[PDB]
Design an enzyme around this catalytic site. Structure first.
Site: not given
Length: 359
Positions: A236, A154, A239, A176
């Site tokens: 997303r 991330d 999100k 991600r």
């Protein structure tokens, strides 16, 4: 040099490293050191800090839930994800760069500033966790963190914090999430004038569009999302759920072969002055959270009593529709520092030239 400007919205009182004399790390080890130490610092990045390959590679178990074609991403079976959430998916072998798994820990009171177009961090992200607060991340690029692998890394993580300002940052080619908040309380956060570049060779939707954009999953969050350029994503984006009040103002959503908003339970969104260009689905329906999308000039006047101004309309071009009029969200802003909102008309043009690192 140092920080330029001040945070708008919820994180307005952020000071970061304050007036500490600027430090210029020369290596990745010094960068990690300065970011994690207990002293207030103003860290200037005037070069690329490449973490790729510094920890070697590892071969492990994974799964392929979105297809086997090269254009698709695969996932590392991190903490039994493939077994618990994708049981019917084929199990595959994956070789990932180890440096992307654990982001660099950023302690309290830091100002991370990139110099010109040179401040770049590759292969490992940043994380403001465990009560660390008062951090400013400005004018840097965080890219290339295991692009083909979900759970391979991330870019920017915030979990259990307060007063975080992410400004003029560019995130790209990440396994991600580009930005992920939660599940603990993140309190006051402002993400502004940043570029979330979703173009990637590997995608969970196998179409060159990144699926894991911005995930706001904190338990007591107030986030201002202003003047950003959300480009080429498929999901997303953002999100929102948990217990997050999101003020989405003057952002440009562009080229989404998929969807943008995912508003879950606990997500309260006030969207005004944004421009949606070529975004297939603006909001996934049905919405489980609440939404005030500044639907028309008359309903927008309702913002006046607490905002001191009317809310601005959103503009749509070759995109899906959106309409929410939950006025109860307006009252959540009473007494808070609310970011200014410009009409949607000149937003697209300006955002493209002013959002991201180096602008």
């Amino acid at each position: 040099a140092g920080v330029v400007g001040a945070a708008e919205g919820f994180a307005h009182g952020v000071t970061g490293g304050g007036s500490a004399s600027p430090v210029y790390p020369t290596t990745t080890d010094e960068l990690v050191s300065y970011l994690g130490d207990n002293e207030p610092r103003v860290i200037i990045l005037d070069q690329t800090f490449d973490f790729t390959g510094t920890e070697g590679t590892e071969t492990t178990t994974g799964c392929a839930p979105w297809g086997t074609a090269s254009q698709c991403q695969v996932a590392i079976n991190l903490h039994s994800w493939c077994d618990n959430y994708q049981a019917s998916a084929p199990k595959v072998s994956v070789t990932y760069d180890k440096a992307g798994i654990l982001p660099i820990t950023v302690n309290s009171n830091k100002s991370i500033v990139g110099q010109g177009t040179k401040g770049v961090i590759k292969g490992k992200g940043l994380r403001v966790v465990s009560g660390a607060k008062n951090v400013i991340i400005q004018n840097i690029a965080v890219t290339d963190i295991n692009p083909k692998y979900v759970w391979g890394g991330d870019a920017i993580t915030v979990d259990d914090s307060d007063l975080v300002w992410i400004d003029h940052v560019t995130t790209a080619r990440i396994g991600r999430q580009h930005i992920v908040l939660g599940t603990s309380a993140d309190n006051r956060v402002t993400i502004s004038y940043s570029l979330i570049d979703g173009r990637s060779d590997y995608s969970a939707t196998c179409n060159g569009h990144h699926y894991w954009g911005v995930y706001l999953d904190g338990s007591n969050d107030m986030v201002t999302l202003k003047g950003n350029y959300f480009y080429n994503l498929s999901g997303r984006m953002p999100k929102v759920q948990g217990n997050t009040l999101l003020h989405a103002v003057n952002n440009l959503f562009h080229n989404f072969d998929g969807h943008a908003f995912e508003i879950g339970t606990g997500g309260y969104v006030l969207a005004e002055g944004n421009v949606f260009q070529d975004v297939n689905v603006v909001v996934e329906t049905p919405i489980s959270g609440q939404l005030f999308s500044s639907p028309d000039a008359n309903t927008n006047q309702q913002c006046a009593s607490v905002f001191g101004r009317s809310c601005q309309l959103n503009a749509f071009g070759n995109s899906g529709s959106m309409s929410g009029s939950d006025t109860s969200i307006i009252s959540k802003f009473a007494g808070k520092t609310i970011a200014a909102a410009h009409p949607p008309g000149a937003i697209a043009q300006w955002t493209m030239k002013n959002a991201g690192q180096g602008k």
